[PDB]
Symmetry: D2
Subunit: 162 residues, 4 copies
């Protein structure tokens, strides 16, 4: 299936035109300390980071920043990402054998930063939905940190609660 | 326990105050969400939640009159009870599920002062429909959250 | 990704299609799918195996109007997980599911299909899946053998 | 409100009484120590209790709590309490659960459990093994529940 965790849904009637992904950045770096703690890494551990844009109905809707433990994702390259017709979580499953069983999220409303605003086609200060996620594999092992910034003007985040 | 659906968590306990309580003919949208007849009477409440002495949420709720008859400002403001608990104990309506739609919005001129912010300030808007037994809708609740000290926590399977 | 709703997890999955048939909706099925009475539905029975042993028996009911062309030939011609097929071939994506879980005794009918004795405790998962607009699109009844696997759930 | 995590819902149309069976302090079993992220040999409080609905036994729950945080938890406190257990943990002990992770399976009623649910040994029960978490992902409870799902089911919504 198309999505693992994405809760974007259109405001208007119909099936959510499916998200198109475009990789913006891809680098390896030393984990910032907050990242290393979220991923239960040793200080100084290398992480792969990706920035991507999701677009829906030909309009940018999400800017995602992801951080992955360098250890498990050594094979991850820009060439792989950009050639890949897969959604990221599907890629992590098929190429890297990493399947997420749970995600813990923290949602807030924030102002569009000077850096983010033009990537979403908006003015700085525009309210955006920030979704900070840590995703877990089996045994409560953290394997991804993702911070999403969502422009919720034509789309909402759908949540059912028990 | 203290909370039924509230997902506010500190980045590093809620106190409620009733702003408004009123009975009226259900607006179209409400009648639809609550699956009421046209113009059926509903009770509407506006309320403010604060945490750590600071305003955090404004909620507008709409409830079907026929299940919430005794529901008065007097019952409310004399109530030292959370609203879902009041609905359970006093009215015998327990919620089994809620469906929510979350968005980020600019603080409206109406809401902004109620949260101590400038109009335009980013707020989390949580539109909820709560269901009781039989997939029966019992409440429409629109919440505007100031997320400067608090976030909305969610776990996904 | 591989799964939409499946919560089976190893204490530490291959699908075989048994049937795919059109019939008039049984009453409980038309009610759940909100169909006119006796509306045509497609029903599927399938078996999931994990580690080369049968683990789940699923029965599924889908509205015929949205699943025209959903045949045994298609299901066998195709590689796809059923939810992925419903999205890619039929354009039906599930946004929500409501489930009811019970422990039940393996019925004389189901016990042989899981390789167990009638009476054996099974996890019964009764699901209704919804698409956009809170339209029910699927009724799925699963019976799960939970001797090596459990159903994982996180609660808020 | 009445329930924190309980997902029991009746099969029959429409809209739960607790009785303490056992209570004591013990050295954590190794698996319990691991679930609660305790040091080896830490003391836990353990409670068994019965839930009934419609004046019939429906649930047997076994609970393990960190002895450190739950020093004042006594039998006399429990049986005098008019509160739901999660309500007591909140109000008396300041422990509030933000999340529960569960593992559900169908099991045979054991000779020990069966009499307490009014069933015969071998009857199918739903086992719900739970770890509950407070803020910061700190585990504060292990609960194993055994549910008779003959007139009740476990309701779950999935996104
Ligand atoms: Cl590009
Ligand atoms: Cl008040
Ligand atoms: Cl979920
Ligand atoms: Cl939940
Ligand atoms: Cl007694």
């Amino acid at each position: 299936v198309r999505y693992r965790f994405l809760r974007l849904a259109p405001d208007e009637e119909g099936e959510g035109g499916r998200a198109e992904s475009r990789i913006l950045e891809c680098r390896r770096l030393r984990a910032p300390a907050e990242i290393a703690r979220a991923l239960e890494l040793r200080a100084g551990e290398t992480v792969v980071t990706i920035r991507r844009q999701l677009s829906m109905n030909h309009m940018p809707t999400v800017i995602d920043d992801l951080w992955l433990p360098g250890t498990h994702f050594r094979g991850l390259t820009l060439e792989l990402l950009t050639a890949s017709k897969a959604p990221l979580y599907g890629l992590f499953e098929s190429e890297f054998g990493v399947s997420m069983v749970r995600a813990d999220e923290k949602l807030r409303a924030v102002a569009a930063s000077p850096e983010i605003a033009p990537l979403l086609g908006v003015e700085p200060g525009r309210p955006l939905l920030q979704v900070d996620r840590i995703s877990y594999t089996y045994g409560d092992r953290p394997m991804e940190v993702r911070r999403g910034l969502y422009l919720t003007d034509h789309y909402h985040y759908r949540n059912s609660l028990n």
